[PDB]
């Protein structure tokens, strides 16, 4: 390649001006802030719009291409601004929206401490059609409906748990509109196991207004809990996997990267793409060991796995 850098394949040098723009003009100087949290989420809301029988283009960038339609899906509340945030970048550069969505996601994760380098591929065509509605899992859906939807897209129950490691770097804006920016765990700027830990704590309070659609009771003030994350943490089909995450940053990193790659290829083929994983920067180290919040004991944690009691 040219000024600065060089990578395994020549067509990957195009990503580097892109890499520079989004770190400064989208990620606030390569930080793990809100825009990073929304780009990661965006990859899912684009890709999960796929079903072998119901339709959808998958990771086709349709959520940007047909933002008028898809950003007004009820399940896409609050996505319309990461779309408009990424649009000027899609406009100036010559990669497809499908490619850019995944790149911004991958690059963004590597800005977060404890993060991982997700494999990124280049060459997706432009979006042909808008995704059908009702393909995006809602936080008030049952475990069965979530697992069936993710399963219909080709994800096993354990894979769903793995992909939900994303909630370690996450916050909600539309669940409780009164308290926007309330994170899913106590360490939203760090990619750790604190999400799986605090989810297993018992419900104690509502951080904002009284229960509204998709919200379960939170353990901590300044933290919000989705109704879907609470159930998945306790459901026999996934409880043991959810608890196994509270243990293992290596596994968390390992599994989050292997499945995101699988997700990013939904309806896209292999050989038509080229590999530019070389481009993704390397995340900083983990900033502290796992722990229960102050004032909490191992009793405060709910047990949902019958095989192995919650590991101290
Ligand atoms: C499987 C069922 C899932 C459900 C029901 C769900 C639900 C939600 C909801 C309701 C929000 C907050 C929306 C708002 O800001 O108002 C959220 C945030 C987020 N989700 Fe999920 N999600 C799921 C899976 C995933 C997956 C597979 C990923 C993969 C990357 C992911 C990544 C994220 C991220 C990064 C955020 C933070 C958004 C922000 O900070 O604004 N989620 N999720
Ligand atoms: Ca799509
Ligand atoms: Ca639903
Ligand atoms: Ca975290
Ligand atoms: Ca206490």
The SS-based structural class is: mainly alpha
- Whole-number count of domains: 2
In helices, the fraction of residues equals: 25-40%
Bound molecules: protoporphyrin IX containing FE, calcium ion
The CATH C-level name of the largest domain is: Mainly Alpha
How are the strands ordered across the major sheet?
1-6
CATH topology of the largest domain: Peroxidase, domain 1
| Main beta-sheet annotation | 2 strands, antiparallel
3D shape:
globular
Provide the β-strand percentage band: under 5%
CATH architecture of the largest domain: Orthogonal Bundle
**Would you count the extended β strands for me?**
6
Instruction: State the order of secondary-structure elements, H for helix, E for strand.
Output: HHHHHHEHHEEHEEHHHE
Q: What's the tally of helices?
A: 12
Rg from Cα: 19 Å
Characterise the protein shown here:
The protein is mostly helical. It folds into 2 domains: 1-136 and 248-287, Orthogonal Bundle (Peroxidase, domain 1); 137-247 and 288-312, Peroxidase, domain 2. Helices cover 36% and strands 4% of the residues. The chain has helices at 15-25, 34-47, 62-65, 67-70, 80-92, 97-109, 143-152, 157-163, 194-199, 227-234, 239-245, 249-264, and strands at residues 121-122, 171-172, 182-183, 215-216, 225-226, 274-275. A two-stranded antiparallel sheet has the order 1-6. Strands 2-3 form a two-stranded antiparallel sheet. Strands 4-5 form a two-stranded antiparallel ribbon. One calcium ion binds next to helix 9. It holds the Pfam family Peroxidase_ext. Ca(2+) 1 binds at residues 46, 58, 60, 62. InterPro entries: Ccp1-like, Haem_peroxidase, Haem_peroxidase_sf, Ligninase, Ligninase_C, Peroxidases_AS, Peroxidases_heam-ligand_BS.
């Amino acid at each position: 390649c040219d000024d600065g850098r060089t990578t395994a394949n020549a067509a990957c040098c195009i990503l580097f001006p892109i890499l520079d723009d989004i770190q400064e003009n989208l990620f606030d100087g390569a930080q793990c802030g809100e825009e990073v949290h929304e780009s990661l989420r965006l990859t899912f809301h684009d890709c999960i719009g796929f079903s072998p029988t119901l339709g959808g283009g998958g990771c086709d960038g349709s959520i940007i291409a047909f933002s008028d339609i898809e950003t007004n899906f009820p399940a896409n509340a609050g996505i319309d601004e990461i779309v408009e945030a990424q649009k000027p970048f899609v406009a100036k550069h010559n990669i497809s929206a499908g490619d850019f969505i995944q790149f911004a996601g991958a690059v963004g994760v590597s800005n977060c401490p404890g993060g991982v380098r997700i494999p990124f591929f280049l060459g997706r065509p432009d979006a042909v059609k808008a995704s059908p509605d009702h393909l995006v899992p809602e936080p008030f859906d049952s475990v069965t409906s979530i697992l069936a939807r993710m399963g219909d897209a080709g994800f096993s129950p354990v894979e769903v748990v793995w992909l939900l490691a994303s909630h370690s770097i996450a916050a909600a804006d539309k669940v409780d509109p009164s308290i926007p920016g309330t994170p899913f765990d106590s360490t939203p700027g760090v990619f750790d196991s604190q999400f799986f830990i605090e989810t297993l704590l018992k419900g104690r309070l509502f951080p904002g207004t009284a229960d509204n659609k998709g919200e379960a009771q939170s353990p901590l003030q300044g933290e919000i809990r989705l109704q879907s994350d609470e159930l998945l943490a306790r459901d026999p089909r996934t409880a043991c996997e959810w608890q196994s995450m509270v243990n293992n940053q290596p596994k968390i990193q390992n599994r989050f990267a292997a499945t995101m790659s699988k997700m990013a290829l939904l309806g896209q083929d292999k050989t038509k793409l080229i590999d530019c994983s070389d481009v993704i920067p390397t995340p900083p180290a983990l900033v502290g060991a796992a722990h229960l919040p102050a004032g909490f004991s191992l009793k405060d944690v709910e047990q949902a796995c019958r095989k192995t009691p919650f590991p101290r």
